[PDB]
Design a protein around this ligand. Structure first.
Ligand SMILES: *[C@@H]1O[C@H](CO)[C@@H](O[C@@H]2O[C@H](CO)[C@@H](O)[C@H](O)[C@H]2NC(C)=O)[C@H](O)[C@H]1NC(C)=O
Ligand SMILES: *[C@@H]1O[C@H](CO)[C@@H](O)[C@H](O)[C@H]1NC(C)=O
Ligand SMILES: *[C@@H]1O[C@H](CO)[C@@H](O)[C@H](O)[C@H]1NC(C)=O
Lengths: 50, 126
């Protein structure tokens, strides 16, 4: 059956697009990640580097 | 090398619509590494026009592009370690003409691909 969408329906009967994201945490050569930090550079001082 | 007439590979476990199969091909621009499954033929001759190595690609995961693989020896090592495919390489001129000469030159790695498909057999395309 066909939805009929019109500008005047209220709040509960308006199009509400949905996007579902599913992640897989299984054991494999994982490739997708997040962004990384790029803090500044210092020299000639006792620091902890990563 | 001499007259070339080389470049191309087909790895994988089987060769009929099962699992996946790399095609490390060269066409002087891009060493495209497609892990998409095809159906193959007996003697696919291409280039110079007629492209009939493949029939169809169904479902696949990886893609890639890079620069090409450049009386000389063209020399590679293909290795697979826990879901990482590695291809070392070297291209060196020689003066001898009989067989693999006496000498020493190490191989400098080129790429590293996380694929995760176990491989059993391979053959070379022209
Ligand atoms: C060498 O082969 C690759 C693989 O087909 C070609 O790469 C394509 O280039 C076109 C041009 O922009 C793209 O639209 C495609 O997406 C690329 N990939 C594929 C799989 O077609 C490349 O163009 C070829 N080199 C030359 C000089 O033709
Ligand atoms: C590719 O593999 C999936 C894995 O189950 C399968 O469902 C699908 O039919 C295959 N083909 C395509 C075109 O996705
Ligand atoms: C690749 O691994 C899967 C699961 O470990 C196995 O079922 C398959 O037979 C292997 N391929 C071989 C041994 O060619």
């Amino acid at each position: 059956q066909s939805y009929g969408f019109q500008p005047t329906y209220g709040v509960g009967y308006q199009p509400y697009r949905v996007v579902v994201l599913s992640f897989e945490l299984l054991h494999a050569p994982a490739t997708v990640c997040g962004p990384k930090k790029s803090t500044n550079l210092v020299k000639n001082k006792c620091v902890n580097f990563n | 090398e001499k007259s070339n007439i080389i470049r191309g590979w087909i790895f994988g476990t089987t060769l009929d619509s099962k699992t996946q199969s790399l095609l490390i091909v060269n066409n002087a621009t891009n060493v495209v590494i497609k892990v998409c499954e095809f159906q193959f033929c007996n003697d696919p001759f291409l280039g110079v026009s007629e492209f009939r190595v493949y029939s169809s690609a169904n479902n696949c995961t990886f893609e890639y592009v890079s620069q090409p693989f450049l009386k000389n020896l063209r020399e590679f090592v293909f290795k697979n370690i826990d879901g990482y495919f590695k291809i070392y390489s070297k291209h060196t001129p020689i003066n001898l003409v009989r067989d693999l000469p006496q000498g020493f030159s190490a191989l400098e790695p080129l790429v590293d691909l996380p694929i995760g498909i176990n491989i059993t057999r391979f053959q070379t395309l022209l």
